[PDB]
């Protein structure tokens, strides 16, 4: 609740761009972590 | 045997006009309050229902496909990832006693219960 409300409050359809950016970058972080680990 | 109580010793007695200004609620008001009570009653259920209906619609769409009938073959996406990724064995790690175990893996993948 607090995460999403904060990115809504601070910065039309701009809230949707910011929310999609947030979700996308989070999933990509987890995937990159897993792959880099399994590459040893 | 019972006792009796005067029915004027059991009821309150006051006429609304002896009240402060805005204490008496009109019908206009009192109806809006009932509307809010109902909406607050159904709010959370409604919202969870919508958020699950989204996923259910997606799952029904994925159900409608059912397979490949209607999809032609594609040459950028064969069905075996080794063709696409250019993977093949080398010179080491290849024992002559391996094919045996290979087979049983195969036998367990195709469902053959013999093993």
């Amino acid at each position: 609740s607090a995460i999403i409300k904060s990115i809504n409050n601070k910065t039309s359809s701009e809230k949707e761009t910011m929310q999609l950016l947030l979700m996308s970058s989070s999933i990509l972080l987890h995937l990159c972590a897993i792959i880099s680990l399994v590459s040893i | 045997r019972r006792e009796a109580i005067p029915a004027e010793l059991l009821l309150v007695k006051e006429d609304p006009s002896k009240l402060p200004a805005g204490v008496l609620q009109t019908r206009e008001q009192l109806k809006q309050a009932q509307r809010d009570i109902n909406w607050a009653g159904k709010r959370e259920q409604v919202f969870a229902a919508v958020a699950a209906g989204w996923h259910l619609a997606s799952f029904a769409l994925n159900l409608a496909f059912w397979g490949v009938e209607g999809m032609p073959p594609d040459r950028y996406w064969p069905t075996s990832p080794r063709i696409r990724l250019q993977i093949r064995p080398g010179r080491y790690g290849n024992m002559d006693g391996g094919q045996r175990v290979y087979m049983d893996y195969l036998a367990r993948s195709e469902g053959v219960p013999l093993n």
Binding site: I4, K5, N9, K15 | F59
Partner: protein, 123 residues
């Protein structure tokens, strides 16, 4: 001048800190929205009566405790970029994220058992 140029792609003008003061004094600024990660930037929308009509200006605010009284004294309407409607959509999104995992696992199971038995390869 305005008379010797082509109209091009409405954007935000820029006031420094001072014509903002004079403008909100003369009663011309009509609404103000605060923004900036440190809450020191203003987007001010003027009113028709001003010289130049309704425009959208940008101002940078360096701490001044007289600002709020000045604004609220001259009928200005402050604002926050959030309506219950928007918060209520954020709640919906959080709920979808809550549900996404069980639906994902039941879809995975269903497709495993579908591929495995009830629609295999033909031979």
């Amino acid at each position: 001048s305005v008379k010797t140029a082509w109209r091009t792609q409405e954007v935000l003008r820029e006031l420094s800190y001072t014509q903002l003061w004079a403008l909100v004094g003369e009663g011309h600024v009509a609404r103000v929205r605060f923004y900036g990660p440190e809450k020191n930037k203003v987007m001010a929308t003027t009113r028709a009566s001003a010289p130049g009509g309704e425009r959208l200006c940008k101002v940078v605010l360096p701490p001044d405790p007289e600002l709020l009284d000045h604004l609220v004294s001259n009928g200005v309407v402050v604002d926050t970029g959030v309506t219950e409607d928007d918060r209520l959509r954020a709640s919906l999104l959080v709920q979808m994220l809550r549900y996404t995992v069980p639906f994902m696992v039941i879809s995975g199971l269903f497709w495993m058992i579908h591929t495995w038995i009830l629609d295999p390869l033909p031979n």
